[PDB]
C-alpha cells in the first residue's frame, strides 16, 4: 500500500511515509508549501515526483529531524526517491541515471588544529 | 562597588576614631589604598603607601566617596 | 522491576560483563531486556606537544566513558544468587536500583 524510503544528509534524517491519493503533503505536521516558504529547493525536493509523472496523485508524510533547514530538503529529496522506487523497480531505471540515489557524501570536515577553519590558515607574516 | 555597607578597614576607623575622640594630630601611615574615605575624617592626613613611600595626602569635603588610592600615585611621572 | 547500570571505560570489557549478566539472568529467571547502549559521554582533552612555545602540531586525547543498561523484571531468587556469585567485573563500576 504505502511507499517508504529513508532520507538523510548532514545528520538530517527524514522518514518518508507516502500514500497514494491527492497531493496533500504533511511533514512534521504543517503543510509542505507552508513549512518551506521562500525557498526554491522546496519544489526541487519534489523532483522525484515530477520524474515519475505523478505530482498531484500522492499524499506524503515525512518525519525529518535534526540538521539544517536545507539539509532536510535534500533528505526529503532522497527519501521520496526510495519511497517511490520501493514499489517500482522500473522507476529505478530512470531515477538512478537522473542521479537521486546518493547520501551525498559531501559533508563538513573537522576544523584542524593550528589552522582556523580546517583549511584557512591565519595570515602568514614575516615583518 | 560594595553598596551594602561601604568598604573600609577597621584599623583605619579605629585609629581615626581616637583622633576624633580628643582631636589629636593627623599623622597616619596606612597601607589600605583599597578603602573608602570616611566622611567626618575631613582635616586629617593619611600617609598612604604606594610601593615607594608614604604620601602625606590631605583630606577635605569633596574627596570622600573615592578610595584612598585615588589620591596617591603608584607610578613615576604621572 | 529492577534496573542495572553498567558504566565503564573499555567497551570490550563492558561487552563481556554486560553479556555475562544477560545470560545469567535470562537462563535462570524471567524476562530481561538486553544490553542497552547509551550515548557515550566522552572527555575530549586537547593540548600542546612541546613544553615551551608551539601553538601547533598539538596533541589531544579523549576519555571514553561508556554506558550500558539492562533491565530485569520479576525478582528471581536464582538470578540474585547467580549475579552475586558468578561475576567477573574489573574496570566496570556498576550501579543497580529498583
Amino acid at each position: 500500500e504505502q511507499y517508504y524510503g529513508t532520507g538523510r544528509r548532514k545528520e538530517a534524517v527524514a522518514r518518508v511515509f507516502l500514500r497514494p491519493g491527492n497531493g496533500k503533503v504533511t511533514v512534521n505536521g504543517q503543510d509542505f508549501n507552508e513549512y518551506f516558504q521562500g525557498l526554491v529547493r522546496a519544489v526541487a525536493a519534489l523532483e522525484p515526483l515530477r520524474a515519475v509523472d505523478a505530482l498531484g496523485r500522492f499524499d506524503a508524510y515525512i518525519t525529518v529531524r535534526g540538521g539544517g533547514k536545507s539539509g532536510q530538503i535534500d533528505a526529503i529529496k532522497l527519501g521520496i526517491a526510495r519511497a517511490l522506487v520501493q514499489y517500482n523497480p522500473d522507476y529505478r531505471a530512470k531515477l538512478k541515471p537522473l542521479g537521486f540515489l546518493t547520501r551525498d557524501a559531501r559533508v563538513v570536515e573537522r576544523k584542524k588544529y593550528g589552522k582556523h577553519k580546517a583549511r584557512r590558515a591565519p595570515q602568514y607574516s614575516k615583518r | 562597588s560594595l553598596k551594602k555597607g561601604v568598604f573600609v578597614d577597621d584599623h583605619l576607623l579605629e585609629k581615626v576614631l581616637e583622633l576624633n575622640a580628643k582631636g589629636e594630630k593627623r599623622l597616619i601611615k596606612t597601607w589600605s589604598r583599597r578603602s573608602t574615605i570616611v566622611p567626618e575624617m575631613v582635616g586629617h592626613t593619611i600617609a598612604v603607601y604606594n610601593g615607594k613611600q608614604h604620601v602625606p595626602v590631605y583630606i577635605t569635603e569633596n574627596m570622600v566617596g573615592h578610595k584612598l588610592g585615588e589620591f596617591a600615585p603608584t607610578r613615576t611621572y604621572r | 522491576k529492577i534496573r542495572i547500570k553498567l558504566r565503564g571505560f573499555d567497551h570490550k570489557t563492558l561487552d563481556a560483563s554486560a553479556q555475562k549478566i544477560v545470560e545469567a539472568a535470562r537462563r535462570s529467571g524471567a524476562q530481561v531486556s538486553g544490553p542497552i547502549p547509551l550515548p557515550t559521554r566522552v572527555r575530549r582533552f586537547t593540548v600542546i606537544r612541546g613544553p615551551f612555545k608551539h601553538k601547533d602540531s598539538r596533541e589531544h586525547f579523549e576519555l571514553r566513558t561508556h554506558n550500558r543498561l539492562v533491565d530485569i523484571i520479576n525478582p528471581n531468587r536464582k538470578t540474585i544468587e547467580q549475579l552475586m556469585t558468578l561475576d567477573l567485573p574489573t574496570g566496570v563500576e556498576i550501579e543497580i536500583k529498583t
Binding site: - | - | F9, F45, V47, E59, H60, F61, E62
Partner: protein
C-alpha cells in the same frame, strides 16, 4: 621560589582566593587541569606510558 611555593599552594591560610590550582606531579604553576590535577606536560608523558586509564589517543 619553586619549592616554598608548591608548599604554600596547599596551605590555604587566608581566604579561598589563594588556593589556586597547582599540578601534583611536576608541580606546575599553570596549565593545571582540575580533572587530572596535573599539568599539560606531565599529562601527555603519562598518557604515552599508559598510566592514564581510559585516556586513549584521540582520532577523528
Amino acid at each position: 621560589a619553586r619549592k616554598a611555593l608548591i608548599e604554600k599552594a596547599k596551605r590555604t591560610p587566608k581566604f579561598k582566593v589563594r588556593a589556586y590550582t597547582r599540578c601534583v606531579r611536576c608541580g606546575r604553576a599553570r596549565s593545571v587541569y582540575r580533572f587530572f590535577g596535573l599539568c599539560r606536560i606531565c599529562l601527555r608523558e603519562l598518557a604515552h606510558k599508559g598510566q592514564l586509564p581510559g585516556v586513549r589517543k584521540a582520532s577523528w
